[PDB]
Amino acid sequence: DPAIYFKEQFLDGDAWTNRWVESKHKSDFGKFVLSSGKFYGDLEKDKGLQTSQDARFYALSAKFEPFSNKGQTLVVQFTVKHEQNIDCGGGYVKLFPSGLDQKDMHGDSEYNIMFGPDICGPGTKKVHVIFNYKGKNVLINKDIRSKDDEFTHLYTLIVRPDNTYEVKIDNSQVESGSLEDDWDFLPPKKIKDPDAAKPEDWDERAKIDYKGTWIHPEIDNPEYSPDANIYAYDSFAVLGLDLWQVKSGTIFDNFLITNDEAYAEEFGNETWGVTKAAEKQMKDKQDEEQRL
């Protein structure tokens, strides 16, 4: 059976304000509002948290039973919908450890993992996969492209006990690999020898012998060691929405934190998969109704 650590779909009207907590680190944070937007799959179902104010920082968070991903898979899933035609704005989530003051959440609050799309002009159009490791928030070496249109898109991060990850957009893989490879967590395995130097007596000839070419010998880095527990965090307790938007209107929906890939895939088919086709159809009616 799959452990559902967190599931949020905003289905019981206003009762979401009991689960979600507004930060007070700043006086002028933006308002989140329950909304399904101007076009949708289903009026009631596709209701989520919409950013309501232009040029504002955002800070809302939801807590759940503290758990650890030690020895098991972690899956973070949600849908983002940039209904506004977004110029610049984050669409990512943050997973925090235990002992976060929800009422004090800001950009510098120490998180475990940040995952999701970030857009700022044509220049920045990427999915962030950031792990907190030994005091450093390390960004993925892989350039993953985020979605920029007005429709709902599903973002999924899978993290496994064997230090492997996967990123899915719309239930299809876009990036894959191992944590050690696609981030710079560890020091390089093979440094150059700090005890060696040329040979001004080195002979670069093969005249008609003593040969080779001077390649500075590499040794094992004494301060390198494998870390099998990179994937592992001692506690996740809070999912935070900590963002900056210029043009507001982004709807977040269908959050899932789980330990099961199959369930996350199935839940995605059951949520984004149900939305996308009725959503596209409604926009097409509004757009042809705008022209003709």
Between 149 and 270, name the residue whose CB sits nearer to Ca ion.
Answer: 270
181: helix, strand or coil? helix
81 is in an annotated binding site: no
The answer to whether the annotation marks 102 as part of a ligand binding site is no
Go through 127-153 and write b for each residue having 16 or more CB atoms within 10 A of its CB, e for each that does not: bbbbbbbeeeebebebebebbeebbbb
The strand pairing partners of 167, in sequence order, are 157, 175
Residue whose CB is less far from Ca ion, 30 or 48: 48
Minimal distance, residue 270 CB to Ca ion, in Å:
12
Pairing of strands 93-96, 56-67: unpaired
Q: Out of 2, 9, 120, 137, point to the residue binding Ca ion (CB under 5 A).
A: 9
Task: Confirm or deny that 224 is annotated as ligand binding.
Answer: no
Binders of Ca ion among 37-66, rule CB under 5 A?
47-48
The yes or no reply on residue 253 touching Ca ion (CB under 5 A) is: yes
Tokens of 21: 């907590």
Contact flag: residue 259 with Ca ion (CB under 5 A): no
Positive/negative CA dihedral, 49, 52, 54, 58: negative
Is-contact 119 146, C-beta < 8 A?
Answer: yes
Query: Under the criterion CB under 5 A, does residue 83 sit at the interface with Ca ion?
Result: no
Residue whose CB is less far from Ca ion, 9 or 68:
9
Count the residues of the shown chain that bind Ca ion, applying the rule CB under 5 A.
5
Residues contributing to the annotated binding site for Ca(2+): 9, 45, 47, 253
Q: Which residues contact Ca ion by CB under 5 A? A: 9-10, 47-48, 253
